């Protein structure tokens, strides 16, 4: 996470793994996910997701939810060409928010910019929407 950036804690990772193994994708996983990922970058969120062993169909459904929210972001935030006024930076695409096409450095650049574009919080919300569909 960013608290400065720090690598995701391995024991916080392992706590998350434990939560999924025991609760699968029952309703109790969503609060735990939420609690365990505070200040997370998209990279960190993906590490969390990519540590889920198996649960293939649950993960496919999640990936599909993320793609829908990413496409919706793009439809409402089209990638208009610059130039930008001073100090301003370029807005993320949906695939940038999901961590697919943005580097950790670019995510930190958004998250610590003034005003910030909280790509970590935006993506975490997409993930939570996906988890709510899975628990059903």
């Amino acid at each position: 996470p960013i608290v400065v950036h720090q690598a995701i804690s391995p024991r916080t990772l392992n706590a998350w793994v434990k939560v999924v193994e025991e609760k699968a994708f029952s309703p109790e996983v969503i609060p735990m996910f939420s609690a365990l990922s505070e200040g997370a970058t998209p990279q960190d969120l993906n590490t969390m997701l990519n540590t889920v062993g198996g649960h293939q169909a649950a993960m496919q459904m999640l990936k599909e939810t993320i793609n829908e929210e990413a496409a919706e972001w793009d439809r409402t935030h089209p990638p208009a060409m610059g130039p930008l006024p001073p100090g301003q930076i370029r807005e993320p695409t949906g695939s940038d928010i999901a961590g697919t096409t943005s580097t950790l450095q670019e995510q930190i650049g958004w998250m610590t910019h003034n005003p910030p574009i909280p790509v970590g919080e935006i993506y975490k919300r997409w993930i939570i929407l996906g988890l709510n569909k899975i628990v059903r």
Binding site: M81, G82, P83, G87, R90
Partner: peptide, 21 residues
């Protein structure tokens, strides 16, 4: 105009001031 590095197409702009940034 661009959307980042090596993304030039047809769009352009005309400055009406110095834009050193």
């Amino acid at each position: 105009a661009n959307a980042g590095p090596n993304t030039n197409g047809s769009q352009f702009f005309i400055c009406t001031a110095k834009t050193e940034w």
